[PDB]
Design a protein around this nucleic acid. Sequence first.
RNA 1: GGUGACCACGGGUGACGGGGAAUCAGGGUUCGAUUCCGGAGAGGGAGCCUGAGAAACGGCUACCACAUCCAAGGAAGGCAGCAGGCGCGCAAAUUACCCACUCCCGACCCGGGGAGGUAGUGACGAAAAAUAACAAUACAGGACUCUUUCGAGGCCCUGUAAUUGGAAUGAGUCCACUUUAAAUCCUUUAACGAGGAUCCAUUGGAGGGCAAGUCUGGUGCCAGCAGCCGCGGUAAUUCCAGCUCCAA
Lengths: 141, 262, 131, 58, 185
Amino acid sequence: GKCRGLRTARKLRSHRRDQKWHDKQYKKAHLGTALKANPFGGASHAKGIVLEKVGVEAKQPNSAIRKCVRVQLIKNGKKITAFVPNDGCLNFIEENDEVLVAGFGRKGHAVGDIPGVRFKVVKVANVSLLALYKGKKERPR
Amino acid sequence: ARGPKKHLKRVAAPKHWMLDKLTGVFAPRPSTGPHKLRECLPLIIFLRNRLKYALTGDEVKKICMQRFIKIDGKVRTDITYPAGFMDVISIDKTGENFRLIYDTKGRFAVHRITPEEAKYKLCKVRKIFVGTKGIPHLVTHDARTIRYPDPLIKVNDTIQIDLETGKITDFIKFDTGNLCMVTGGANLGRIGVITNRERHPGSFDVVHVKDANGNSFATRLSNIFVIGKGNKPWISLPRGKGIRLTIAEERDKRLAAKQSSG
Amino acid sequence: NDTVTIRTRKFMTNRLLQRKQMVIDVLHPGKATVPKTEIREKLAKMYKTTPDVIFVFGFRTHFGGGKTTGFGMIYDSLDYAKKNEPKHRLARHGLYEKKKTSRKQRKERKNRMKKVRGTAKANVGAGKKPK
Amino acid sequence: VHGSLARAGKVRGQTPKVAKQEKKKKKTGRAKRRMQYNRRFVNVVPTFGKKKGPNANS
Amino acid sequence: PVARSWVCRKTYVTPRRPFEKSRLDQELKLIGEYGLRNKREVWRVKFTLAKIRKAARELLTLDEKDPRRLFEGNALLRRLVRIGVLDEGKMKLDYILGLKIEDFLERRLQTQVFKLGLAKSIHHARVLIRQRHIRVRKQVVNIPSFIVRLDSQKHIDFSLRSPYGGGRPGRVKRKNAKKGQGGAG
RNA sequence: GGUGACCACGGGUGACGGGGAAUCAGGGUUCGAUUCCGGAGAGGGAGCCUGAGAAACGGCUACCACAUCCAAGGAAGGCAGCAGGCGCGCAAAUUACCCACUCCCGACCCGGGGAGGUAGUGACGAAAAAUAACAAUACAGGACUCUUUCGAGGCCCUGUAAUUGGAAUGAGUCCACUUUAAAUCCUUUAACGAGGAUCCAUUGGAGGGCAAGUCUGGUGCCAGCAGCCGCGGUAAUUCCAGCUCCAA
Ligand SMILES: [Mg+2]
Ligand SMILES: [Mg+2]
Ligand SMILES: [Mg+2]
Ligand SMILES: [Mg+2]
Ligand SMILES: [Mg+2]
Ligand SMILES: [Mg+2]
Ligand SMILES: [Mg+2]
Ligand SMILES: [Mg+2]
């Protein structure tokens, strides 16, 4: 069992801080390697430049092409893949656009049937993708 | 900091000034003087917030510069003069005199006194020594020092300063059974009679004091200001006679007052 | 005028500045806020004084109209009004003129005097050419 | 790439564009809550239909 | 720096779980009964009741004859009987826990004018208050959520300038009168 | 000699410390650059003059790095002060007015103060609070009631459509006052100001979790949706739409 002595608080505290490294959340938040590996670098959103429009096959039970963009982040110059999340917004996307990119929803983890995609496009050419989809405002030609 | 401060924050001012937060960022940092700034009441807030004679600092400056305020019998044109404990604020143009005394709730109260009572001022001695040529010097809780005092006066005793002369009229020895007043801490503003003084060498001595209601409270020696012999004060006491009432009794006193007025 | 009345509370006299302070509540049932000139003339009638030494300000109208509370100051003599009053209250009645220039321009002028040293003529003429 | 991006937006492009029909302006705020409260706490009538939902397509 | 205050607090607390049929129906019944604008009114009065219950619980766990319990409990009880949600005779800390949300909601000015009979419905009462028609004592109040006190209960009446106390009819009445008189010379 | 498993020494810190903030059974877990207190710094170091008080930087000297003018001999710098730019970025406002308030400085009731106050931008956030109310006809509902289903009205309550149908008000235009250093705003008060009161409430959803459609039309394992289960291969309650509902 566990010690209960009146002056075992040092051992109890040391054991807590030693065993707190054994769960993934605390290790992830306090080692720093995950933050270093994060392409966003601890930011909620990030801007980038569209390099290429690509299609990603969905997972096995489903059968579809998810439309994504290869994006080079303007800060730290890293290349990521961001899902363009609507029915025909890949047509709104073109080459070399300043796109705002957010996480996909579950904290640097792949979502749904899309393999290895952790990000999604929020804005393109400084105009909201939702606005473009709804037709509230047109592309700046 | 690279030197002395000369600004005071409104929220960092002493609580007993009753300075509200919204009117100003700053507070009237009291000029150096007889009393410490944590336990002094500047003339500006005395004339603007306590008596409501003036509306702002400019108005109170005009009152001060027209030379009507005589703190300790001397005309003081300083707007932030530290008044401090048991000082006489005499406005002869209105023919009114104020003895600055803490009330029950540990804050200075507007205490009107008669002109024949405004000519003397009690003082607590702080240190006694002998200067050059074997001359006994005696300092008080103010910055006031006097020469040739009665050898019977020892430390933390009381003396009666006669104004316009700066001399001694009478004195009070500090001992058991003498009416006093607390001038700091939780018991600040409480009137009682000394009952015990316990000594802690190398530390602050602690006295036990009983008021008229029989309530016994302790305090440090340095916070004790004897203001009378036996059970009779040497000065007119403020309203409430320095008797501390807990929240319930003042609540029902308020209720009785409102019920009598209504 | 038909139904407009003045009432005075928290009244007191101070000879420290030789005046009388009070807070005045006006009662206009269905009218707008009563103007300060009308307030001054009615207070002058109330206190038997000429309606030019009076000073009234800080008038807040209560929600829904009706009562409006302000601060009134009535002096014993017209001379003390210049001696102890803020300049803006005097300027409202016209007893004081503040026909002056911009604070920014004053600061520019003061900075130019800092550049020009010593010579009285140039120190006072540095503000002429850059007008 | 597999060259299969050409189908992007297909169904939204193919969907016939039927426009919305003009309707009476809906009440909002306190009156909307009042109408909502009346529709399910005032016109209450017991029925063998096991308390059909507000959007029943019977 | 600045002489601001930035002291504020939220007056309501959102429910832990959304989409419960029982809670939604009960809150909608309260909204319909008392003419509330949205769920935030019922949530704010619920939060006020919760705070009162929390203070009462702290005092109850506090020992009897304790000066703090006596002082704070008497203050809380007298303010409750002052707003009239507690009866004059039931001045015990235990009965504070027995209070509900309906007796708070019945002290609002919107419900009070309808109960006193100046209005035909609760929603008519809310709009009537909002168009500055009702005064309490000498002061005209346009806040529907005005919690009235027992002494002020009797003095609820119409404002003098309204076209329900004194004269000066509304603009639509005056326009209709001038149109009718312009139709016949 | 001194300090160390009662963790020295070293390293890291995306570490200024505290009062405090968020969460809120209890215990705790995170956050405190940020208006109060204390510390440090004025591009990086270093050294000094004066002065009571400075290792001062809206003081000086030198070096390192940037960088301004030049008649090429020289000379002049320090916005982590208020504004305002560039750069960095997901990310943050006016090159505005005033010393009227709070205070401070000065030889000083009189001058000065981007301290500070005022206004501007401001859906960070917090409080209150419109977008409709009522009356009479219809057709329903109620323990409705009169005879004990059939018909009606001596009642109560919704919804649908109407010359209804005439009462009430702000949101806005805008006279004046008021506020104020000058103002702006709020509060007052004249005159207009509502029947698609078109003076138009939105954002997300309707398989389950989780409140709400086995509606209709398109697509047909595509397009897409889907935080998770899953949906989609021809009548898809899950996509794209219309209608209708649901939540705030
Ligand atoms: Mg740091
Ligand atoms: Mg800090
Ligand atoms: Mg600081
Ligand atoms: Mg000096
Ligand atoms: Mg320094
Ligand atoms: Mg330096
Ligand atoms: Mg609208
Ligand atoms: Mg749908």
